[PDB]
Design a binder for this molecule. Sequence first.
Ligand SMILES: CCC[C@H](NC(C)=O)C(=O)O
Ligand SMILES: CCC[C@H](NC(C)=O)C(=O)O
Ligand SMILES: CCC[C@H](NC(C)=O)C(=O)O
Lengths: 332, 332, 332
Amino acid sequence: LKHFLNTQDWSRAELDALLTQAALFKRNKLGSELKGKSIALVFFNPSMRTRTSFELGAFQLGGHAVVLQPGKDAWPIEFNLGTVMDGDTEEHIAEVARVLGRYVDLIGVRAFPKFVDWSKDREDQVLKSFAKYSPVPVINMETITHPCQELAHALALQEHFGTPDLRGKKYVLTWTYHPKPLNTAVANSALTIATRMGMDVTLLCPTPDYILDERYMDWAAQNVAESGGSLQVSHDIDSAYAGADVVYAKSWGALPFFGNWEPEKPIRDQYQHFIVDERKMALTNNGVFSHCLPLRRNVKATDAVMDSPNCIAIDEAENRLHVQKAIMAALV
Amino acid sequence: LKHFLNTQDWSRAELDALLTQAALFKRNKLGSELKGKSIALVFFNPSMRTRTSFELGAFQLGGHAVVLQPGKDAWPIEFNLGTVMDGDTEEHIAEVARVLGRYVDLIGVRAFPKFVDWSKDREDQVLKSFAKYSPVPVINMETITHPCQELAHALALQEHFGTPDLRGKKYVLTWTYHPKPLNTAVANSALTIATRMGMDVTLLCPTPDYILDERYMDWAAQNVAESGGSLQVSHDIDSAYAGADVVYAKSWGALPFFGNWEPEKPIRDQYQHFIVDERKMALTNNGVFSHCLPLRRNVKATDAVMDSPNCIAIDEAENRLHVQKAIMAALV
Amino acid sequence: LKHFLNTQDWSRAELDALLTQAALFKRNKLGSELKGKSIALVFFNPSMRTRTSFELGAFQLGGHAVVLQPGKDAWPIEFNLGTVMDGDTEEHIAEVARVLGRYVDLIGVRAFPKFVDWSKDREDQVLKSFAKYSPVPVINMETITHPCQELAHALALQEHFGTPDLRGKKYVLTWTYHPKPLNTAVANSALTIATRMGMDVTLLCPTPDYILDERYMDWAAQNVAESGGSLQVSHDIDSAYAGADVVYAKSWGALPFFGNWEPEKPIRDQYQHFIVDERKMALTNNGVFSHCLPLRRNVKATDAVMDSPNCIAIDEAENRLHVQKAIMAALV
Ligand SMILES: CCC[C@H](NC(C)=O)C(=O)O
Ligand SMILES: CCC[C@H](NC(C)=O)C(=O)O
Ligand SMILES: CCC[C@H](NC(C)=O)C(=O)O
């Protein structure tokens, strides 16, 4: 059974095929690839673009999406095995996934980490459990990686540069400020796809404490050694931005401070200058800027940067619809 | 770009065309005016009729509605310009409207005032922001006016009297009781459409403090001088109801007490007799009664009045579906 | 006007026809029985299977389901007659049902008892009110009985035994543990359909305090005297399970302790051994086990029992989709 849990699990040929079908769907939006079929969109956290794009995608391909929110409308779910369910959870994922599998043709799941202990969050328990127990394909709508965002992002880049081959371009994945510590998911994904596409990647972040999990630093290393690109970690703003072709910002809490954010607060607060403004973007080679959204203006990026003709965030956002339809079509 | 923010922005010819198409859709409900198209229904407050009627309307015309609730499922939105987003809001309407505009063909928005300061609520910031930043038509699903309700109401009246020409009829817009101070939106809208239709309008309310915002009193004045009707403010029940052809009730907090409801509580509480009962309706010329709903029985109107054959509230409620389909068809 | 409030209200011929159409829909899922039609699914409590199955069912038959949650998105509703609505409820069911009746073709309603006073919960006020005021057919999505579950369950049994005639088989409806007192709805329904199908039924429960409401014990008595089966109440585990062909578990709070659960807590807590495990199921005649779900593993039933090839709960869950489509088709 083929799932869409991570682009890393797919071959470059399969990913290229997805992106191409995405471009094709962008040209002809209505189709019958999902006629009479349905997808259950399970959300354990908030969403605007993901819920909307998947729901419309199913509709445009002749299918139907059922939106579920455990703890809100659906019953809370237990994932640990062999435990006595006398707590807050009403049913086990074993039953949930099997039941849904009798109703729908695809299952999407969004579940952010709990931020109490990275040792447990990094195991990707919710996603793996759905994939384990579901008799139908499972799609990652963001857990500790955000693969649908990776493809929307990659397509937007290929569209901007007018070619599927991004090798050569200097890609800068920069950390940015936010009053709260966030998920590293989008950053892990950006690092993964940027290297898989063979670009010259630079992970710009405040201090070594903000370096991503080894799992992704290693995926990136293997991707580079096979794509022809390169990976580099930096803590100097100006040097990183210089000559860049692409700048992708994202904020995230330092992994070493999981379950202990009290001391990390003052640390991030002294790096508010990592905000993407005109000054930094001027150091790039007429490079493009993007963010996965939602974005806090004048915090993560300035109004000027967001309204700049070089900001392709809205195009990347649109592409979420096209890439997802390609993913659903490929899995059914 | 044409939007449906207020009937006042539309010409009488355009409004007559909408009402006619509404009547046509009421005769033939299934159509293809929205085939493959979609509308994002953004709700910042509760709704039963609006969400249901729009959702079914999109379905019946071959399209699909995506229901969103910022703060509930979708991310909270910021509307103020050039501010530092380090508060409760995650993204700016600038991005929200542009992203949705890449997904859907129409955007509906419902956003009640905050009731903290009428000076800010009356600016209609949420609605204006969507219309400003959206690349697709925007529809007012109720903010400080309720135009979809105006047309459902007008159509119901034309159906009751068997003619589109309502000139001559005596229309009474009466305030009614409610334990809490409410939005003036429906009252502002009733005053607007009743005069636009050229009826003899009387705004019956407890005291001068309950008179509506000058903006709408002025719209009404201009509507009368062009429709042939008339406007009048009254504080005497019996005289107002006498010979009336239509009685539309609605409760609302006195504008002069915005952000300071403590002292207004005892004021409204001494006017519970403004409730629409058999006695008052008997003073009318076999007139009809209606309310936008939801209605608190034995508080706003008595059970007898609600179950009276002269109460057309259910018909007006149904018309919300037909008028809205006419609006969506006209905007696409 | 025909509604689907309880299987008891339907003749055996009509129920047999529903089950047959259910089997037919299971063979050919896409149809046009609800083309252009819609159903309003009103939920006053949580749901995963019910919301999903009804929503997909409407879609597969060419219709559309509108999901509503009073108090969450829709306005709170009042059901008592002739009262002054100055409390938490915004509108009366009289208006709600009539308005929905102008929009949709069917109305489903789920409303659990309040658990404050069985004397009032047993009156089934919400369901009866919808059926009273709605101009369109009403469907019970679970209140104090769960008829859609009854048919999904019955069909699963007929499929397992390879015949619609279940007479002769020994059916055991056993109470099970749960940290909290639950609704008796599913148990009342199981007792009702098991006897209506003419099986040898045994209601196994801890003490006489856990016996179901007389209303259902009486329905069962009348069903037996007409179906040829038999009814029996038991408090001895091993004797009940011995030679059973079917074992259906469900937990519920003792009716005599409604509104006074404090003292019942220690009572249920001393019967945790009523859990359905391998030991008990081994006493059966290679019998099948099922539960309506959601189920707490290692509390209501053990992991071994749930993963046993004799557990048909997933099949019963799937059947909810098929039986419901048969119900909607029959009512339109
Ligand atoms: C697109 C994912 C956004 C989510 N953002 C927040 C602010 O929680 C995150 O950081 O993963
Ligand atoms: C149809 C709009 C109803 C809303 N009512 C309440 C009670 O908030 C209002 O007064 O504007
Ligand atoms: C299928 C109905 C399940 C509901 N369960 C809970 C746990 O509330 C009940 O006991 O009625």
